[PDB]
């Protein structure tokens, strides 16, 4: 967006076992990054490996 434009966004990752989130309050209960859009144009949120089993199937 424009250089004089502003926005604050919440990136939320919900581990398996729980419903796909329907609200920000539901998503914010999980792993999340609040991103203030400013001089740094890009956010990088790393999805941590959350699993019991050591390997997941690609299919």
């Amino acid at each position: 967006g424009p250089a004089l434009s502003s926005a604050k966004l919440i990136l939320a990752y919900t581990p398996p076992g729980a419903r796909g989130p329907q609200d920000r309050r539901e998503a914010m209960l999980g792993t999340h990054v609040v991103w203030d859009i400013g001089l740094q144009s890009t956010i990088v949120m790393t999805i941590p490996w959350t699993s019991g089993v050591q390997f997941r199937y690609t299919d």
């Binding site: 919900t14 581990p15 398996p16 076992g17 729980a18 419903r19 989130p21 539901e26 998503a27 209960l29 999980g30 792993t31 941590p48 490996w49 959350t50 699993s51 019991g52 089993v53 050591q54």
Partner: protein, 256 residues
Amino acid sequence: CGYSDRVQQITLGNSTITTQEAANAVVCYAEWPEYLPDVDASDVNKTSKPDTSVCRFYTLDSKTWTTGSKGWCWKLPDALKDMGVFGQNMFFHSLGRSGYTVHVQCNATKFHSGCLLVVVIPEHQLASHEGGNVSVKYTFTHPGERGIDLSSANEVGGPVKDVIYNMNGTLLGNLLIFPHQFINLRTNNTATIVIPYINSVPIDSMTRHNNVSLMVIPIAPLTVPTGATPSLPITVTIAPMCTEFSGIRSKSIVPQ
């Protein structure tokens, strides 16, 4: 050298259990429960250890042992899903790992006769009564604190209730290979079994899988003296131990 062995007491958090007619407590595979070490860990989320807030004894509703009762079955951690902060953490976290100290109590007088086999079976995968390739529905395998009564009738989509075939196609006399203890009313009023985490993975889903299944099965039937009530109360007490939780997320949704 003057001492006694029947008196032992276990204090976990703010709860204390005392006994005067105990048989030596059993520790499954001679291994005390322990936290997941870094050399075995897979998920990178740092684990939440709630200590004394969850590591304490919870009493399950008492069952009535009659002369015609077939036995009783409980699934863990499902049996503790409504028990305080352990029950909430178990639904608020995606993955969990926990050991347990099981303590079964059945007190009687010096005239009563009967013997219970208290045994813990890892992955006690139940058989449906319908045979063929029929599956056991989630609602019958995850009953919660009221457990499974083996004396009741079979149900559609439910597991089989023939105790002699262990609800899975093995005979009852062979259950002694799994960590077990007998509550022989002539010798004991309490069985105790300390279980470590038993799974092929380091940490796992607590809502989709039951790691162990606790079975209390009367072998020698209850024999009450002439004129006494033909029934005796059984209380099961379970404490989570060396508990680990990982992957916090919105509250988990399960059937019913």
